[PDB]
Amino acid sequence: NKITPNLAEFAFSLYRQLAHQSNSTNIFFSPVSIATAFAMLSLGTKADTHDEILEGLNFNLTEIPEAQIHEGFQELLRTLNQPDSQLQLTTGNFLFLSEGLKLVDKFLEDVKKLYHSEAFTVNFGDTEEAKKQINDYVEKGTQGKIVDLVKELDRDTVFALVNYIFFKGKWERPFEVKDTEEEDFHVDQVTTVKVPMMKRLGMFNIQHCKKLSSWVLLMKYLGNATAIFFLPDEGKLQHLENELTHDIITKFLENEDRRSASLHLPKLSITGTYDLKSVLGQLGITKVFSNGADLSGVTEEAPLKLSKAVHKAVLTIDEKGTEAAPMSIPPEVKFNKPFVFLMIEQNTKSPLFMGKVVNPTQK
């Protein structure tokens, strides 16, 4: 591809932003899902409001232009939602604009054409009636999987953006279920939760990276995906999260050896809701949320500005995989403690998902 280099960093710089604010919760989101959502939204913005968004995603408009970025995002977004694509990954965008605006046509047009997104006008006057239409709009277009999302709306809201994404993959080489069994997972030096622990002795592209001071495991997905797990040495969690860099993962990936290992990957299902305004705000993206907001590409009547931007992602990890099938002690590698992981898109290498698991039970 050609944006992986930047989304990769966006992914990271986005991560150390949500992690900074609560090193006690699980963290899970799709860097691509979001960039896509703002790259999409950028379509209806102009001037600085516009350039500030694409830059905020680590793009340098003077060394590459939009009419190529949008090109790249769409090439990737296809890969995922594609036809044969049985990777089981759903994702979309909701756009709620205050009813009473002659919204430019072309916009809605492009939006629901390339960036898989739908627009719905609502009555922001009634703080509760909008809350209602929305929570319900979402619960309908989400197949009833996301309920009562928006807990509480604002008062002067006039534009709201909801971005979602569910994912549950099957591995190339699956785990027998008769083998998984409950085990201790040390979330803290004091707390300990019991959790189902999938286990399998196999040939892995696992290796103990000294630079990151942590075991790094690679697990291929059935499809155009790949998951990389990082198990950090005692108290090296913080370090790991600090020394991570695209150039490093990139190298790891390149290598092609493989050695015996006894894996203890935990069976888990986690999600993560986040309010982007604040975070992206820290990452440079402000105008679209401020007052000047140049959203002329969306409406030409009154002023307008993104008031709320929410992101919900859901992941499920299990033993599922392709239906099918005393001489050198292999290293035991048990993920029974906080660990960081990242999902890559096989073709483009872009960062599909990113997270930390601090408690397999927490929600």
Numbering used by the authors: 24 to 348, 357 to 394
Quote from the publication.
The plasma protein α1-antitrypsin is principally synthesised by hepatocytes and protects lung tissue from degradation by inhibiting neutrophil elastase. It is the archetypal member of the serpin (serine protease inhibitor) superfamily of proteins. In common with other inhibitory serpins, the native fold of α1-antitrypsin is metastable and this property is utilised in the characteristic serpin mechanism of action.
The structure of Gly117Phe α1-antitrypsin was solved to 3.2 Å resolution, allowing confident interpretation of the secondary structure of the protein. The asymmetric unit contained three molecules with minimal intermolecular contacts and in an arrangement not suggestive of biologically significant multimerisation. Electron density was not seen for residues 349–356 (copy A), 348–356 (copy B) and 348–358 (copy C) of the hypermobile reactive site loop. Before incorporation of the Phe mutation into the model or any restrained refinement had been performed, clear density was apparent at the mutation site, indicating that its side chain was oriented away from β-sheet A towards the F helix where significant changes were seen. In the refined structure, the F-helix is displaced downwards (towards the bottom of s3A) by half a turn relative to its position in the structure of native wild-type α1-antitrypsin (2.7–3.5 Å between equivalent Cα atoms). Conversely, repacking of helix F–β-sheet A interface residues, in particular Tyr160, is necessary to avoid steric clashes with the adjacent Phe117 side chain and sustain favourable hydrophobic interactions. In the refined structure of Gly117Phe α1-antitrypsin, Phe117 forms the centre of a cluster of aromatic side chains, interacting with Phe119, Phe143 and Tyr187 (all at distances of 3.5–5.5 Å). The side chain of Tyr160 is in a solvent-exposed position in this mutant in contrast to its buried position within the helix F–β-sheet A interface in wild-type α1-antitrypsin but remains well placed for aromatic interactions with two residues of this cluster, Phe119 and Phe143. The increased biochemical stability conferred by the Gly117Phe mutation on the native fold of α1-antitrypsin is therefore related to increased stabilisation of the F helix. However, stabilisation of the upper turns of the F helix and/or its downward displacement as seen in the structure of Gly117Phe α1-antitrypsin will reduce the propensity for its remodelling.
